[PDB]
Amino acid sequence: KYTDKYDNINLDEILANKRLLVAYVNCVMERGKCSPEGKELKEHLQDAIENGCKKCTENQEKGAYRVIEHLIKNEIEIWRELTAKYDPTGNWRKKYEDRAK
Numbered sequence: 480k481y482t483d484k485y486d487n488i489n490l491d492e493i494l495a496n497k498r499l500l501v502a503y504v505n506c507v508m509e510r511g512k513c514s515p516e517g518k519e520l521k522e523h524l525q526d527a528i529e530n531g532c533k534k535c536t537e538n539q540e541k542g543a544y545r546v547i548e549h550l551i552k553n554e555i556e557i558w559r560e561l562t563a564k565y566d567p568t569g570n571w572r573k574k575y576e577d578r579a580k
């Protein structure tokens with residue numbers, strides 16, 4: 480089971496501040512420095528894609544959808560690079576895009 484120690488981080492504040500959001504994106508894309516939380520996310524994202532969040536907490540599932548919907552609607556280029564890197568066979572791309580729409 481993934482740790483819940485970072486589960487009280489306010490995702491709304493991150494999504495509303497481009498500088499904060501880009502820091503996490505560059506970390507997960509393996510082109511920028513990581514915060515402790517960013518490193519933890521980077522280290523579990525591939526696994527979560529392979530098993531549909533089987534080890535995610537309820538807060539992580541809810542938070543993943545919040546972040547993903549925001550990217551699909553407002554940061555298309557970021558969404559595309561993330562899904563291409565972590566989900567190259569497209570297990571979830573159409574499913575999340577359909578929900579967002």
Ligand SMILES: OCCCCCCCCCCCCBr
Nearest residue numbers: 485486503504507516539542
């Ligand atoms: O439940 C919250 C734990 C994860 C803490 C990191 C939040 C990062 C959210 C921004 C992700 C941007 C796409 Br890489």
Ligand SMILES: OCCCCCCCCCCCCBr
Nearest residue numbers: 481519520523527528531543
């Ligand atoms: O259905 C595929 C899920 C895609 C999003 C997975 C988010 C994984 C969150 C990992 C949290 C680790 C603590 Br920082």
Ligand SMILES: OCCCCCCCCCCCCBr
Nearest residue numbers: 539542543546562566571572
């Ligand atoms: O095709 C699926 C690609 C999934 C990439 C989205 C990663 C965003 C995860 C954010 C984690 C937040 C949980 Br608090």
